[PDB]
Symmetry: C4
Subunit: 334 residues, 4 copies
């Protein structure tokens, strides 16, 4: 009977082994980027509009050819059986039932075909493999299984240095595997190789520089995710939310611009929208819900977010997510 996302963090902390909670919670380095994701959202204040017609508030959007129930998708988080035995299938089922896109990870602990069979028109997150042809096989598999977008993670030439995991000597338990298997630095040529191999929208995840956003458009990306990988890659990378406004201006409608990092309420969703985001991704909260109560947990989380998004939108005078994008903001202190 949770009333905010923080309820679920506590519940997940109680049930998960410490080293697993740390694998989930932690960031790279001193966790400066992890913390900055939160600080950056806290400093954003919305300027609500009043006395608008709210006789049909809708939180729906159209993205990558599909209607979604909220301007939100479940972020790609690897190895979800770490958190609950049903892992990715529990999350995907809840996401489907909520009308929220679910991003299947290259490092999923259940095969992408089994996750896609859940239904819910899922997305597929790609990590570039040591060989172009194995990469492109994942893409084709995803597409053949009915995934509707390829989320190419471009901020992971290699994994960041996570000191929690080093101090814990954390390693996958033997009962969790990379189920899509029986990694190399991506480049712009890799992007092109993917774009040529699929007619699905290619979404580049982990863009923070304005000219990288621009180049993503030029490269034929259908979207980008403005993201510092939840503070888990470069420690000291700017939060996506701090780059988002500038990026949205630069691409000037040329692709969808998503953001992630630290989204913890419908109000946060509203802030991201007001800064110009098409949609957000949510990572850690979904895994807290999964750890706490499995599929039911994720369903309750998504219902809570949905209600908070609708509440925030209406209180801000927005009948639609488009209207929310036209809200103005003001930076405040603490």
């Amino acid at each position: 009977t949770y009333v905010s996302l923080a309820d679920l963090e506590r519940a997940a902390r109680d049930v998960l082994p410490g080293e697993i909670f740390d694998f989930l919670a932690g960031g790279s380095g001193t966790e400066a980027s992890l913390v900055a994701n939160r600080t950056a959202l806290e400093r954003v204040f919305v300027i609500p509009r009043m006395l608008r017609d709210l006789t049909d508030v809708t939180t729906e959007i159209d993205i990558f050819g599909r209607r979604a129930a909220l301007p939100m998708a479940v972020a790609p988080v690897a190895y979800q059986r770490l958190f609950h035995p049903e892992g990715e299938l529990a999350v995907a089922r809840a996401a489907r039932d909520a009308g929220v896109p679910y991003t299947i990870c290259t490092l999923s602990s259940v095969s992408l075909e089994e996750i896609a069979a859940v239904g819910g028109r899922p997305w597929f997150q790609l990590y570039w493999l040591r060989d172009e042809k194995r990469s492109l096989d994942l893409v084709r598999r995803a597409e053949d299984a009915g995934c509707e977008a390829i989320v190419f993670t471009v901020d992971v030439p290699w994994m960041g240095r996570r000191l929690r995991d080093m101090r814990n000597g954390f390693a996958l338990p033997e009962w969790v595997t990379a189920a899509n298997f029986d990694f190399a630095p991506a480049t712009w040529e890799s992007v092109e190789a993917v774009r040529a191999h699929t007619d699905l929208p290619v979404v580049l995840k982990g863009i923070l520089a304005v000219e990288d956003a621009r180049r993503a458009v030029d490269a034929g990306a259908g979207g980008i995710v403005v993201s510092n990988h939840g503070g888990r890659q470069l420690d000291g990378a700017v939060p996506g939310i701090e780059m988002l406004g500038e990026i949205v201006a630069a691409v000037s409608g040329g692709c969808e611009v998503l953001v992630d990092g630290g989204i913890r309420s419908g109000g946060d969703v509203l802030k991201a929208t007001a800064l110009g985001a098409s949609a957000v991704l949510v990572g850690r909260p979904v895994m807290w819900a999964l750890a706490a109560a499995g599929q039911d947990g994720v369903r309750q989380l998504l219902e809570l977010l949905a209600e908070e998004v609708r509440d925030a939108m209406g209180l801000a005078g927005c009948e639609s997510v488009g209207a929310a994008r036209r809200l103005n903001t003001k930076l405040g202190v603490v």
Copy 2:
């Protein structure tokens, strides 16, 4: 024998049931807007003027056709019998005796006619009802009872999500009722309907966007209250005090511009004035005083505020509230 408003918060905390103190104290969401109301005032510093004639310092203003003793009114706070058995009549009597306008709430726990009978030329706060005609009946009742302004709350299409009240499972005790009765989203058309129905000044409460202030003037409002509803509506809404200067400039004397949220001293009143406010509203402190010592409590609070306003004005070289509006300010840190 209180020397600041914080004395009365402690006294109210001691006497009220926890769930009632929480209903009063709390805001929506993570209470970001609640806290920001205070932070925003703390960051404002006044640039006082020296060596001016102070041989008749006056704190009086003329507003909505009436002289008021201070640039201050009691904010509309619902269900005041929650805090003290005499509820609204205790507050209204103290306000009358102090020469301070009292705002009667649509959700008052004593009928608007009984409160108005106290005297003191009160204001009436309107919430828009599911039917235009019931709304307009409240207006007419208020007017027939001698209310001198209609404070139309425009930031409440519905009530915000107050997690204290959810976590407490708070509900009105059966001995507190909405005494004006034996709610729909307001729009600009609702405003017009009200404006056409009364010759009293219509004051729109809960304006934060500059173009909403502008439109309020265009709409024939006699005033606005720049307000985030004490942090109880949209969590992450900008504090009114952060919008006030821009709003005052935009309306360029076309209506009175009031502010509220976090006013806790005569010095705060001075800051709001220096930013351009015609007057402030004060909410929670009046309810602390009511809970602590009933009518006497509210009288002591209003006397303390009056003395602090006069002290701050004089120390800043202002013989009048108009002069205080011409003070300059500087933003500082913490």
Copy 3:
């Protein structure tokens, strides 16, 4: 054997009755201006210059016709017998011996003539009295006793609201009196009355507005003290150090521009100088030293400040206080 001013605060706290320590330490209201005096100095960073000739570093200045050993004077602090039985004579003797001007208070607990007899060419702080003629008698007395400047306090139409003193019910012990006696709001006309009555330099203390600084020059002031009275007058008044740069620019050498509030080291002196101050006043630290060890205490404090000023100047590449005024600064965080 103190190495910083904070050593002496602790020592004074140990020896003084609490209510007296509070009378000394406290400010008005919530102590926002008191704290801001410190915060404002902490945020100032100096840009030192290197490789300059330091073969005769001097901390001396010429001010109001006299050489002073440091760009520093002892601020006017009333009733110094509250802190030590020798009161003002202990402080004045130490100041004389250090070559630092001492400001005699209108509310001194030893008569201005006895303090002036100590020697050291002292200044006299004026509070305007209910009658022009009694005010001007104080001035003439001061002058006849060999005071070299009149420091007219202009930020005290009346005393601020000090909640420590109210909560303590603090009052002068019967053994401390206003020894110059056997108060009205000052105006610009009062200033003129003083200026016409003495050929001593008139220094207006408690100026914070730029146009008040300008007008002080126009009025024939020989100096001003940019000051919020140590946070003891208007609570929420800007710190002097935040106004100083703008004020120095505006007066454009037309009078000496002193600053006070929170000066606690030679480094602070350097910051004030770099912002354009002619000199600083130091209040509370001198009273800590007095309370801790009487005349000897004040001598040790002034020796410590002198050494810290010389050290800071040299490390910043300044052979003279003039050179220090030409240093640049940068605002930092915390």
Copy 4:
């Protein structure tokens, strides 16, 4: 088996006598500049670039005619036998083996000739002596011993006031001596005297003012170190990292521009690079490593830094330190 530099601080704290740990850790005054070195780096966020070719990431630079393995040198820290019995020889050996320049101090506790014999093409830090000829003898000795640059410390006309060392009554133990011996304020003429006496690059250490950087170039310096001496000289001096961008712009490639103060990770190195630094110096961390585990300790520290630099560079899309200099940054909060 350390995973960050903070591991080594704890280890050094455990093993060193308190007064020695304090001599190492402390700064001048209230330690404002010491703390600001850290704060200033924490506020810098990097804008990483994605999808660049990383098939030969190199951390090497060419500086002062030599290839270095990292854009990093060991800062001049006096009396290193205070921390470990092998003192400077332990550090120099580790630095040589890591391919990192080591700066030999004028106040080294082992003679400059013995340190230089370790190999590793070392630099020599000069303090100006009371007599030009003794100064220039040190220079010539350094050069004759195969030092490759003279790091002239120009921010030490005399040593700052370190209150830890005063409160501890700290003094060199009799078993630590200034081994180069059997001090006067430097000026621009001193610089010239040095420049005329050696063909080695002269690097001026402790420049913070832009026009001092400019003048260093004009003076024929081959480099500068933008530095507040680790917060140990002027308390309230701006951090070097806050001046670096402006200084790099002003010198416009006319000399190498190094920075130091608070560098505690490869990410910090990356930030300094992105602000335009040619290289950084690292002081206290190297001494922690020395105290913790002697030569082995310093080797582990330099290996950890090397890995963190390579990791940060790659994650930011930089194949080279030059590319890292072309990264953009954004200031954030806390």
